[PDB]
CSV table of C-alpha atoms and ligand atoms in Angstrom, one decimal:
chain,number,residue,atom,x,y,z
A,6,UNK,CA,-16.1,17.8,9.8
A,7,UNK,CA,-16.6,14.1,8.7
A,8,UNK,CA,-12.9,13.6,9.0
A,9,UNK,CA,-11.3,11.4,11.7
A,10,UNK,CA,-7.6,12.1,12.8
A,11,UNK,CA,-5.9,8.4,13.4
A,12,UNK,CA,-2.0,9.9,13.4
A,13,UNK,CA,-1.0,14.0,13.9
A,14,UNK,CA,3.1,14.5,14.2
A,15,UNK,CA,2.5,18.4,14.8
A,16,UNK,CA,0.0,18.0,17.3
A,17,UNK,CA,1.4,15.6,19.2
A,18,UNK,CA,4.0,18.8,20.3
A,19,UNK,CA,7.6,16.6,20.1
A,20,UNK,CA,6.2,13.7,21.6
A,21,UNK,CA,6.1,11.0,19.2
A,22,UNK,CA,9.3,9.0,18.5
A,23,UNK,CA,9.7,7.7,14.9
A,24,UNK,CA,12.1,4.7,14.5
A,25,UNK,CA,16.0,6.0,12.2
A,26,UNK,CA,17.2,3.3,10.3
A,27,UNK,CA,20.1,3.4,10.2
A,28,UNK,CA,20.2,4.7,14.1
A,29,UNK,CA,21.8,7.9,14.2
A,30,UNK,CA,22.9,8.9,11.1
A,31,UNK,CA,20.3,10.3,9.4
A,32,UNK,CA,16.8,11.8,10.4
A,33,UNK,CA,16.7,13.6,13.4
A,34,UNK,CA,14.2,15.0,15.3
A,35,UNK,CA,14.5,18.8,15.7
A,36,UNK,CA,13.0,21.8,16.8
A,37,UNK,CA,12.3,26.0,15.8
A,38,UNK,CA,12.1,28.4,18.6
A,39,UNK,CA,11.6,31.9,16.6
A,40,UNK,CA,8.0,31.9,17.3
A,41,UNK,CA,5.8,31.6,20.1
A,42,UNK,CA,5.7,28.0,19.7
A,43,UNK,CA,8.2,25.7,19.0
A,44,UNK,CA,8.1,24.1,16.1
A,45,UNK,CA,9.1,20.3,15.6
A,46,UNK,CA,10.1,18.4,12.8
A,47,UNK,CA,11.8,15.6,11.3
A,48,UNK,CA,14.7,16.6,9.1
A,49,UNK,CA,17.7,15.0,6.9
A,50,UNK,CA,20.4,17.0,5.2
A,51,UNK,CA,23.0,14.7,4.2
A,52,UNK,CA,23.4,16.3,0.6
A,53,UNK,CA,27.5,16.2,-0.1
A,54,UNK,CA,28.1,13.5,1.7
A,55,UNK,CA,28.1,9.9,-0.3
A,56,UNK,CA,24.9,7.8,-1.2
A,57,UNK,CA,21.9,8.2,1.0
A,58,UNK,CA,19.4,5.6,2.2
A,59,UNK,CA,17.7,6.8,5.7
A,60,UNK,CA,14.2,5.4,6.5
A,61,UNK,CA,11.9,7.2,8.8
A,62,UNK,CA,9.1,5.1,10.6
A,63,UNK,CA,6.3,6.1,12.4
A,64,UNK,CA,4.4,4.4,15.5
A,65,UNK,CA,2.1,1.9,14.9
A,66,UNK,CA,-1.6,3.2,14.2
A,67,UNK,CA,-4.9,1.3,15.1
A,68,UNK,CA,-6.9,1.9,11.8
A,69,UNK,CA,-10.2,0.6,13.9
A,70,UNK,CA,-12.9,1.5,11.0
A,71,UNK,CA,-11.0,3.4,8.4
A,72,UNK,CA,-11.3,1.5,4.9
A,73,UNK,CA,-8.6,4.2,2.7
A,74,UNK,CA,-6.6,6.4,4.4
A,75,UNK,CA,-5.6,10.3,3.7
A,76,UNK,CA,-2.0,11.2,4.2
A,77,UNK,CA,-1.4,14.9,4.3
A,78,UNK,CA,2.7,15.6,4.4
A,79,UNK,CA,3.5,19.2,4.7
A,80,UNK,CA,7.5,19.9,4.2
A,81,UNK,CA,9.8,21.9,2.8
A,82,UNK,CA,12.8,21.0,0.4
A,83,UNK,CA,15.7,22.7,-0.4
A,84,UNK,CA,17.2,23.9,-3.7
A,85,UNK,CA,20.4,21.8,-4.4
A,86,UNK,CA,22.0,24.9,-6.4
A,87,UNK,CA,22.1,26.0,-2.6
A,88,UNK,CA,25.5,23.1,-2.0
A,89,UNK,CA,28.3,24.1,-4.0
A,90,UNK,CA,29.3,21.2,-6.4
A,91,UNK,CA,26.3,18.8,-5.6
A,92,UNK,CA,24.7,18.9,-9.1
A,93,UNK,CA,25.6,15.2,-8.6
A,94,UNK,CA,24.8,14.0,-5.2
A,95,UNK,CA,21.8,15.9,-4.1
A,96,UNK,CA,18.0,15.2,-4.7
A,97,UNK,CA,15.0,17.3,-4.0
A,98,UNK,CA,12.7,14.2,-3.8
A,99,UNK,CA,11.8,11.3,-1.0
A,100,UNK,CA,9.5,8.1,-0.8
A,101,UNK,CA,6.8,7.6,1.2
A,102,UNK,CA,5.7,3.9,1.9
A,103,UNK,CA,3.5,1.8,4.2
A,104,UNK,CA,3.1,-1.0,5.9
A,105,UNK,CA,0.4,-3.1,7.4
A,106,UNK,CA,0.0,-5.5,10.5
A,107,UNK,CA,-1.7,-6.9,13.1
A,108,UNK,CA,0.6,-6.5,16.1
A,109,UNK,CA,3.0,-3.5,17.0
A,110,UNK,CA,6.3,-4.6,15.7
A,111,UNK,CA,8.4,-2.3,17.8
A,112,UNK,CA,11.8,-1.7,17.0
A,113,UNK,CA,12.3,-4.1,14.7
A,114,UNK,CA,12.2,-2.3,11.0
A,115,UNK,CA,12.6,-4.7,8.4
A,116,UNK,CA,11.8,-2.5,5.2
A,117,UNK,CA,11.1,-5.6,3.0
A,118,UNK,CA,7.5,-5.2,4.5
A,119,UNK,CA,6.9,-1.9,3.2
A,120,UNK,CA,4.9,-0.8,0.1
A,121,UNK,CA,5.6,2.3,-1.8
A,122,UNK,CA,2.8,4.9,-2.6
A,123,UNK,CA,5.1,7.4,-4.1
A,124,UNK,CA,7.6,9.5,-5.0
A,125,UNK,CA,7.1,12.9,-3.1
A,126,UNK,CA,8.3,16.1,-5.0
A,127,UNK,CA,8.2,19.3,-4.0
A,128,UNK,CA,5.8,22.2,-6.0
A,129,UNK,CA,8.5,25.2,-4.6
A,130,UNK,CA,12.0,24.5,-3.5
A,131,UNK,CA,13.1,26.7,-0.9
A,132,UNK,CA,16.4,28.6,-2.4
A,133,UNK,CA,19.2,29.9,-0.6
A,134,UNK,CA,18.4,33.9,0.0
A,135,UNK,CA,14.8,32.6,1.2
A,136,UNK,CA,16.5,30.5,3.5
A,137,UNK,CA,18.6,32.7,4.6
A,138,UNK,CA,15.9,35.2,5.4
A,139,UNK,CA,14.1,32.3,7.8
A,140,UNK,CA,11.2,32.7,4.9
A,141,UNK,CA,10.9,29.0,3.7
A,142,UNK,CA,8.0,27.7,1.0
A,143,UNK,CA,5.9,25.0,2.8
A,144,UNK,CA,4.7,22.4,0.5
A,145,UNK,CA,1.6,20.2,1.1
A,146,UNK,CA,0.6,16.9,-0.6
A,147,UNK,CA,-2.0,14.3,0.2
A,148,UNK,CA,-2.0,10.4,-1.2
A,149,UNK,CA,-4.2,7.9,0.4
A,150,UNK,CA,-4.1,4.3,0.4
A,151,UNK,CA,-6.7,1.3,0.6
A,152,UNK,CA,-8.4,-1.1,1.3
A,153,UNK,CA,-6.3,-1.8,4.9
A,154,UNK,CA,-7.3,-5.3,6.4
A,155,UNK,CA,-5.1,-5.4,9.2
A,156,UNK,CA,-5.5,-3.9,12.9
A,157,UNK,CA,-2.7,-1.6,12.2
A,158,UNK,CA,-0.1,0.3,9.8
A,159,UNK,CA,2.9,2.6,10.0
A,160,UNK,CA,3.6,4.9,7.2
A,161,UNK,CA,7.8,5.6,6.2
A,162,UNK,CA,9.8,7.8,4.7
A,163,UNK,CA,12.8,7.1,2.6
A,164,UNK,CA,15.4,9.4,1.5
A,165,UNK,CA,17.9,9.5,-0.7
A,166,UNK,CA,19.8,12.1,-0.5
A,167,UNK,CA,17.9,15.2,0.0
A,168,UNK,CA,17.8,18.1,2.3
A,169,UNK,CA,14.0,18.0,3.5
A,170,UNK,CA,11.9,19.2,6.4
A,171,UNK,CA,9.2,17.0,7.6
A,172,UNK,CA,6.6,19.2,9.5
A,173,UNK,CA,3.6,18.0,9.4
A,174,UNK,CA,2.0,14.6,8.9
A,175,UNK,CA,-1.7,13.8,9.4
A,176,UNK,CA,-3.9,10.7,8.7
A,177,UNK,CA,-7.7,10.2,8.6
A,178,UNK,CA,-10.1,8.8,6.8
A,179,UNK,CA,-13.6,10.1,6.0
A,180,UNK,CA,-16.8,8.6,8.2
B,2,UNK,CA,24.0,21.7,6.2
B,3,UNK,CA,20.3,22.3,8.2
B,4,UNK,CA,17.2,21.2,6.3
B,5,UNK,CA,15.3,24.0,8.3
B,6,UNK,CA,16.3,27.4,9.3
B,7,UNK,CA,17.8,28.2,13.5
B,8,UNK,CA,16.5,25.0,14.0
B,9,UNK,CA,18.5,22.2,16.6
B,10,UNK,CA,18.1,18.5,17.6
B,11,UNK,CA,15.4,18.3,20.2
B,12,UNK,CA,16.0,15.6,22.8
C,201,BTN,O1,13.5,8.2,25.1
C,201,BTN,C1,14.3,7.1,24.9
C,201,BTN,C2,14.9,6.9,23.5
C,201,BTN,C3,15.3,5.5,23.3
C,201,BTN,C4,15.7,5.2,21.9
C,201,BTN,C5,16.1,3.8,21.6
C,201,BTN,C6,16.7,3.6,20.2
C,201,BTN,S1,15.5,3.6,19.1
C,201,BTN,C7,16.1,2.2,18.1
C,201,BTN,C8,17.1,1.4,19.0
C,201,BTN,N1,16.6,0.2,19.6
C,201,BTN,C9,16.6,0.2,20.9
C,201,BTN,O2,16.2,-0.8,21.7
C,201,BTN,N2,17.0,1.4,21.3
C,201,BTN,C10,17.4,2.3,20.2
């Protein structure tokens, strides 16, 4: 009710475009047509296959009033018992950061500028015969940052090596 | 490996 949406990825239906560092070789945007709807997300997978450092950025957001922001993440994460012999290589976290500014910076990512607010770890993994029944576990966390004093921020998303499902990613704050 | 399940790049 008192709640005021500044960024939705799900309901924007696959039309925002989030900045890859680096380009091509590690988040991708992809979709689910089983339902209905299709489903969007963004998604990484690079479990067994050397050290992982992918950023995910989002488009610049006007904060206008908002004070502290909400983040609300829903994703899903997969068990790394699923990959044979990654007991080494593979995670089941990711970071989630921010960034504030004035002026839309574009395409230029420089992750100096960022600001962790946490680690993000998952309350189920989703195992293998889940997975392979198209049944996964959805997990859902909120963090919230403040006081902004800029015009705008972008949030990002680092990983490290996981295999992770990004599906939703909302942020308001309360009026 | 796929993060998600029957899922493809959308572009
Ligand atoms: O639609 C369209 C997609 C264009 C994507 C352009 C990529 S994003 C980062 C990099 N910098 C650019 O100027 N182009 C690529």
């Amino acid at each position: 009710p008192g709640e005021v949406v500044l960024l939705d990825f799900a309901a924007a239906g696959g039309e925002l475009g989030w900045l890859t560092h680096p380009y091509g070789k590690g988040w991708d945007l992809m979709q689910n047509i089983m339902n209905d709807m299709p489903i969007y997300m963004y998604s990484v997978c690079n479990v067994m296959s050397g050290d992982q450092d992918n950023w995910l950025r989002t488009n610049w957001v006007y904060r206008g009033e908002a004070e502290r922001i909400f983040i609300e993440l829903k994703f899903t994460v997969r068990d790394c018992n699923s990959f044979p012999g990654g007991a080494s290589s593979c995670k089941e976290t990711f970071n989630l950061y921010y960034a504030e500014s004035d002026l839309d910076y574009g395409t230029n990512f420089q992750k100096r500028l960022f600001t962790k607010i946490d680690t993000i770890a998952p309350d189920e993994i989703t195992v293998s015969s889940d997975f392979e029944a198209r049944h996964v576990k959805l997990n859902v966390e909120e963090r919230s940052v403040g006081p902004l004093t800029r015009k705008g921020f972008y949030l990002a998303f680092q990983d490290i090596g996981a295999c992770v499902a990004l599906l939703s990613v909302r942020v308001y704050y309360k009026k | 490996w796929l993060a998600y399940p029957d899922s493809v790049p959308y572009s």
